[PDB]
Amino acid sequence: LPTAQEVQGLMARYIELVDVGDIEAIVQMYADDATVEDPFGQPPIHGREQIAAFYRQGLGGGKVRACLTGPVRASHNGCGAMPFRVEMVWNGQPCALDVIDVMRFDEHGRIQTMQAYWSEVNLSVR
Amino acid sequence: MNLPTAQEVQGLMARYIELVDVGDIEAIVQMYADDATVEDPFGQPPIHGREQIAAFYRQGLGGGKVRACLTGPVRASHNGCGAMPFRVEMVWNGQPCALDVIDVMRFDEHGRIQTMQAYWSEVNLSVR
Numbered sequence: 001l002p003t004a005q006e007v008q009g010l011m012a013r014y015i016e017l018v019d020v021g022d023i024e025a026i027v028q029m030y031a032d033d034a035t036v037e038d039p040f041g042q043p044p045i046h047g048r049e050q051i052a053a054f055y056r057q058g059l060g061g062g063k064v065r066a067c068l069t070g071p072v073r074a075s076h077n078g079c080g081a082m083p084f085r086v087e088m089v090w091n092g093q094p095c096a097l098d099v100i101d102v103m104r105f106d107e108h109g110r111i112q113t114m115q116a117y118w119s120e121v122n123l124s125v126r
Numbered sequence: 127m128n129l130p131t132a133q134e135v136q137g138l139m140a141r142y143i144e145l146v147d148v149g150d151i152e153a154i155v156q157m158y159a160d161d162a163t164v165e166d167p168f169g170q171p172p173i174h175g176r177e178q179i180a181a182f183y184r185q186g187l188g189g190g191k192v193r194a195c196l197t198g199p200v201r202a203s204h205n206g207c208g209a210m211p212f213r214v215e216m217v218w219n220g221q222p223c224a225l226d227v228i229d230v231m232r233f234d235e236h237g238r239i240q241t242m243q244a245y246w247s248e249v250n251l252s253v254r
């Protein structure tokens with residue numbers, strides 16, 4: 001599995017791709033059988049077309065930004081967790097959302113599971 | 127308490143950090159369900175139940191000189207779960223060190239911690 005240091009690089013790369021809005025590059029980071037639970041508590045999304053649609057829905061507008069708010073925490077079993085903040089415009093109102101993503105990577109360095117922790121308690125109207 | 131709401135999760139997880147910060151081992155243990163699991167660090171074997179959990183916190187905190195504080199807000203779900211970023215300050219080689227950690231928790235229907243996973247490794251340890 002990816003080492004702790006490699007997990008830190010992969011998870012930071014993911015945020016860089018979200019921030020620029022490269023949907024195809026994000027989807028490429030995922031494994032064939034990957035699941036996305038975003039927000040955690042909702043049913044998992046699976047299937048590569050379905051994951052792509054999820055990111056297109058979320059990032060299609062092109063005006064979403066995302067940045068780490070602290071370092072990636074990484075394990076020795078190919079997993080990690082990171083805190084970040086998303087900036088977006090919601091019905092014309094600039095907003096921010098605080099999020100933590102937890103990821104497990106497979107033996108090939110691809111995301112096998114992603115879980116995004118957030119709810120409206122983490123939303124701030126700027 | 128029932129299964130905590132998102133707002134209740136934020137309060138519970140923040141109190142947990144306050145209890146770690148002050149070192150009240152018995153109060154930490156009582157926040158956990160009687161049959162809770164802990165994986166700390168995530169990747170290592172889980173430990174089961176309040177007796178084992180108490181031994182774990184006494185071994186980590188009993189020596190004193192550990193402090194802990196949130197580094198950003200608790201992220202909370204609608205299914206009784208949450209995740210939080212924090213930093214632990216302690217002493218290493220006679221000098222301050224710091225460890226960045228994220229804990230993920232799932233609460234039960236009585237407002238007690240059913241599971242906890244702590245994400246960190248030696249890449250998250252730093253010094254002056």
Ligand SMILES: C[C@]12CCC(=O)C=C1CC[C@@H]1[C@@H]2CC[C@]2(C)C(=O)CC[C@@H]12
Nearest residue numbers: 018038058059064086088097099101116
């Ligand atoms: C998909 C996403 C970014 C990538 C990531 O890793 C985690 C999230 C979860 C919150 C999403 C966000 C994208 C922008 C969204 C759709 C909003 O405008 C409201 C909720 C928010």
Ligand SMILES: C[C@]12CCC(=O)C=C1CC[C@@H]1[C@@H]2CC[C@]2(C)C(=O)CC[C@@H]12
Nearest residue numbers: 146166186187192214216225227229244
């Ligand atoms: C148990 C603990 C606090 C409560 C919490 O929620 C997460 C952790 C994980 C890292 C522990 C820390 C306590 C202090 C420890 C023992 C050290 O001096 C090195 C590793 C670190």
Ligand SMILES: [Cl-]
Nearest residue numbers: 070071197211
């Ligand atoms: Cl942080």
Ligand SMILES: [Cl-]
Nearest residue numbers: 069083198199
């Ligand atoms: Cl944060």
Ligand SMILES: [Mg+2]
Nearest residue numbers: 159160161234
């Ligand atoms: Mg029970």
